[PDB]
Amino acid sequence: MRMDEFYTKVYDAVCEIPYGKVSTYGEIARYVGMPSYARQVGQAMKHLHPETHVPWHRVINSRGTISKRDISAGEQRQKDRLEEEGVEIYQTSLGEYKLNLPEYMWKP
DNA sequence: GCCATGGCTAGTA
DNA sequence: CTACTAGCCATGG
């Protein structure tokens, strides 16, 4: 399998998500049959124009937190998205937006 | 050829 | 609970 097909598969998947629930970079590389490519899933999302109707925000690291993404402050748009999604979000000791991971994982 | 990034994971201290 | 490991891997200079 080449890239770009890859990219799409992902995108389609991240639309397969149910409003409210979420998944995980790894939990998606694993799925589109490309287990190891978790890190590329981040990038895939990193790309994306702001004009999209794709559910970027509702996706996280296996830690069940908003990944750092060092270069950004959309970490907030991601937050202010799901407290909008009804998903309850709790800020954390020395920073961090975390939340009950397994209330919201996704299943066929 | 190289390394330096990256929205990563899964260990084990 | 945190911190710091291995490994993983495009992508671009």
Domains observed in chain A:
1-108 (1.10.10.10)
User: Could you tell me the two tokens for A62?
Assistant: 């296996």
Contacts of residue A30, defined as CB under 8 A and 6 or more positions apart, other chains included, come to A38
Q: Which long-range contacts (CB under 8 A, 24 or more apart) does A14-21 make?
A: A14/A45, A14/A54, A14/A55, A14/A56, A14/A59, A15/A54, A15/A55, A16/A106, A17/A55, A17/A58, A17/A59, A17/A106, A18/A106, A19/A85, A20/A82, A20/A85, A20/A86, A20/A87, A20/A104, A21/A58, A21/A104, A21/A105, A21/A106
Q: Are A106 and A17 in contact (CB under 8 A)?
A: yes
Q: Which amino acid is at A10?
A: V
Q: Which nucleotide is nearest to A37 (CA to C1')?
A: C9
User: Could you tell me the two tokens for A36?
Assistant: 């190891």
For strand C, the positions having any atom within 7 A of a protein Cβ are 1-3, 7-11
* Method by which the model was determined: X-ray
Helix (H, G, I), strand (E, B) or coil at A24: strand
Cα R_g (chain A), whole angstroms = 13
What Å resolution does this PDB entry report?
A: 3.1
